[PDB]
Scaffold this active site. Structure first.
Site, mmCIF file in Angstrom:
data_model
loop_
_atom_site.group_PDB
_atom_site.id
_atom_site.type_symbol
_atom_site.label_atom_id
_atom_site.label_comp_id
_atom_site.label_asym_id
_atom_site.label_seq_id
_atom_site.Cartn_x
_atom_site.Cartn_y
_atom_site.Cartn_z
ATOM 1 N N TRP A 47 0.847 -1.199 0.000
ATOM 2 C CA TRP A 47 0.000 0.000 0.000
ATOM 3 C C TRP A 47 0.884 1.251 0.000
ATOM 4 O O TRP A 47 1.427 1.547 -1.080
ATOM 5 C CB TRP A 47 -1.097 -0.137 1.040
ATOM 6 C CG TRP A 47 -0.773 -0.208 2.491
ATOM 7 C CD1 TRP A 47 -1.097 0.729 3.427
ATOM 8 C CD2 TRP A 47 -0.288 -1.350 3.220
ATOM 9 N NE1 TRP A 47 -0.738 0.289 4.676
ATOM 10 C CE2 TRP A 47 -0.251 -0.988 4.580
ATOM 11 C CE3 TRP A 47 0.170 -2.616 2.847
ATOM 12 C CZ2 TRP A 47 0.183 -1.871 5.582
ATOM 13 C CZ3 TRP A 47 0.662 -3.457 3.826
ATOM 14 C CH2 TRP A 47 0.652 -3.092 5.171
ATOM 15 N N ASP A 48 1.074 1.941 1.103
ATOM 16 C CA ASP A 48 1.851 3.208 1.118
ATOM 17 C C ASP A 48 3.177 2.975 0.384
ATOM 18 O O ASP A 48 3.932 2.054 0.727
ATOM 19 C CB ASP A 48 2.146 3.711 2.517
ATOM 20 C CG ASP A 48 0.950 4.112 3.361
ATOM 21 O OD1 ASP A 48 -0.190 3.789 2.968
ATOM 22 O OD2 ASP A 48 1.204 4.766 4.399
ATOM 23 N N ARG A 204 2.569 9.527 13.263
ATOM 24 C CA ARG A 204 3.144 8.670 12.218
ATOM 25 C C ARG A 204 3.520 9.514 10.996
ATOM 26 O O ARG A 204 3.151 10.711 10.941
ATOM 27 C CB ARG A 204 2.168 7.573 11.800
ATOM 28 C CG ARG A 204 0.764 8.020 11.435
ATOM 29 C CD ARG A 204 -0.060 6.860 10.947
ATOM 30 N NE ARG A 204 -1.443 7.173 10.677
ATOM 31 C CZ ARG A 204 -2.446 7.137 11.569
ATOM 32 N NH1 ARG A 204 -2.236 6.775 12.831
ATOM 33 N NH2 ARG A 204 -3.660 7.436 11.180
ATOM 34 N N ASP A 205 4.107 8.841 10.045
ATOM 35 C CA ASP A 205 4.392 9.338 8.667
ATOM 36 C C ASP A 205 5.401 10.480 8.680
ATOM 37 O O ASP A 205 5.124 11.548 8.120
ATOM 38 C CB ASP A 205 3.098 9.717 7.969
ATOM 39 C CG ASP A 205 2.071 8.620 7.790
ATOM 40 O OD1 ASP A 205 2.385 7.453 8.140
ATOM 41 O OD2 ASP A 205 0.858 8.974 7.469
ATOM 42 N N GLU A 289 -3.251 12.777 7.185
ATOM 43 C CA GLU A 289 -2.195 11.745 7.060
ATOM 44 C C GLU A 289 -1.107 12.143 6.062
ATOM 45 O O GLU A 289 -1.319 13.063 5.227
ATOM 46 C CB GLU A 289 -2.746 10.402 6.593
ATOM 47 C CG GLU A 289 -3.946 9.929 7.381
ATOM 48 C CD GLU A 289 -4.232 8.460 7.146
ATOM 49 O OE1 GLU A 289 -5.215 8.166 6.484
ATOM 50 O OE2 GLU A 289 -3.472 7.629 7.716
#
Length: 418
Positions: A47-48, A204-205, A289
């Site tokens: 995915w990502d 996150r991220d 996100e």
């Protein structure tokens, strides 16, 4: 004399901004994904997708090899847990369980597409947490050294980095030496919300970058505005300039997403200080996100990916890419296209893609989630979507042209030996 500057403050993405979101604008809608899309692996879901890049944001090949990092999970077609009543594999259950078993893989190609799988970045036992969630692989130098910034998840959610090296030959690419994960920071509870404050907190991220104006090193990440879940207030500033009849914020004080920023004390990305958030969306969306920049025309284009489902009560919009623009790193930012919406999924295929990443060349990569194939039927992707070109123009964006599945061409090539 003293030249006074306006103090830096968080830019509010207000409910009034969100009421401008148009789900039917052909200039901000992703092209429809075909039901016959190809799948890049029969062994893993991806995915990502995190293209290799330098600290300035340039998508980089090494000795002509394009490199991507992916969040990756096994496909488990023979698992008894995923067999339906008639004894057939239900892919949707397996796909839904990816997050709990996420690991970083790498892939490579001399064409920027038709990716060849490289395997796990970190060997078994290196990762100190159960899951590896998304971040950024930063190519540091001509020795091929990489800092992989990522999110170590469970226990906690910590921004970490791990140093390794890419090695190429004429047959392909290897990732070596990713052995020593280093903790950088976690949610503090005064600026960014902690797990103690909210079991559903985001942290996150990480997206590190060198600021093109100052040359200092900073890092974006997704957070939530600090405070106990349910304690936030949707006040006049969070509501914004709503029109008559639109004053009711409902229970939207439960949606508290924000784009965080940290600053580094060195050029090496080793010692970080948390700063207050750049963008807050209290009363508007819980999930801002994968925050990331494009620097263009002396401006800061700040993109973030979000969901229809995480909007505040009384508001809606599509899954996809949202964004803001400022003249200055620390704002003030304004919403792109008036609402923030840059690239929404089409309402006929609302979950076709996610985790978009706008590259500085205007190309936007995303992975395929769910594509309808009839009244009831749908396919799961876990593979790359068609890349889409967008144009950034002042405080507008425009969708331009669709490219091949997973097309992620390099902006620079770096000559690596060791």
């Amino acid at each position: 004399g003293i030249q006074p500057y306006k103090p830096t403050k968080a830019t509010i993405w207000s409910r009034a901004d969100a009421l401008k979101v148009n789900e039917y604008d052909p200039t901000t809608t992703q092209p429809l994904v075909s039901g016959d899309f190809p799948v890049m692996s029969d062994e893993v879901f991806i995915w990502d997708t995190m293209p290799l890049r330098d600290i300035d944001g340039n998508i980089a090949s090494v000795n002509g090899w394009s490199v991507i990092f992916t969040l990756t999970a096994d496909r488990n077609p023979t698992a008894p847990e995923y067999q339906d009543e008639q004894g057939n594999y239900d892919i949707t259950l397996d796909w839904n369980d990816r997050h709990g078993r996420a690991k970083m893989y790498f892939w490579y190609s001399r064409t920027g597409k038709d990716w060849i799988i490289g395997g796990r970045v970190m060997a078994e036992g290196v990762s100190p947490t159960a899951r590896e969630w998304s971040g950024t692989p930063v190519l540091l130098n001509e020795r091929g050294e990489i800092d992989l910034y990522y999110t170590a998840v469970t226990p906690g959610a910590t921004v970490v980095k791990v140093r390794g090296r890419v090695v190429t030959t004429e047959n392909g690419v290897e990732m070596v030496g990713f052995k020593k994960v280093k903790s950088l920071f976690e949610a503090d509870g005064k600026m960014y919300q902690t797990e103690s404050q909210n079991p559903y907190w985001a942290f996150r991220d990480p997206c590190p970058f060198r600021d093109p104006k100052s040359g200092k090193l900073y890092m974006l990440f997704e957070g939530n505005v600090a405070g106990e879940r349910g304690s936030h207030v949707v006040g006049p500033d969070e509501l914004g300039d709503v029109p008559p009849g639109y004053e009711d914020a409902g229970n939207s004080h439960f949606q508290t997403g924000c784009i965080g920023i940290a600053v580094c004390r060195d050029e090496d990305g080793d010692d970080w200080e948390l700063l207050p958030p750049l963008i807050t969306a209290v009363g508007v969306n819980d999930q801002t996100e994968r925050p990331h920049f494009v620097f263009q025309d002396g401006k800061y284009y700040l993109f973030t990916i979000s969901h229809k489902f995480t909007y505040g009560d009384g508001l809606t919009g599509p899954d996809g890419v949202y964004g803001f623009v400022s003249e200055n790193l620390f704002g003030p930012y304004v919403p792109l296209n008036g609402s923030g919406l840059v690239l929404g999924n089409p309402p006929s295929q609302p979950y076709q893609t996610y985790s978009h990443y706008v590259m500085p060349n205007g190309l936007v990569t995303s992975f395929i989630d769910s594509v309808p194939t009839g009244e009831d039927s749908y396919r799961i992707g876990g593979t790359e979507a068609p890349t889409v070109l967008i144009k950034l123009k002042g405080a507008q964006t425009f969708v331009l042209e669709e490219f091949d599945y997973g097309y992620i061409p390099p902006m620079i090539d770096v000559k690596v030996e060791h």
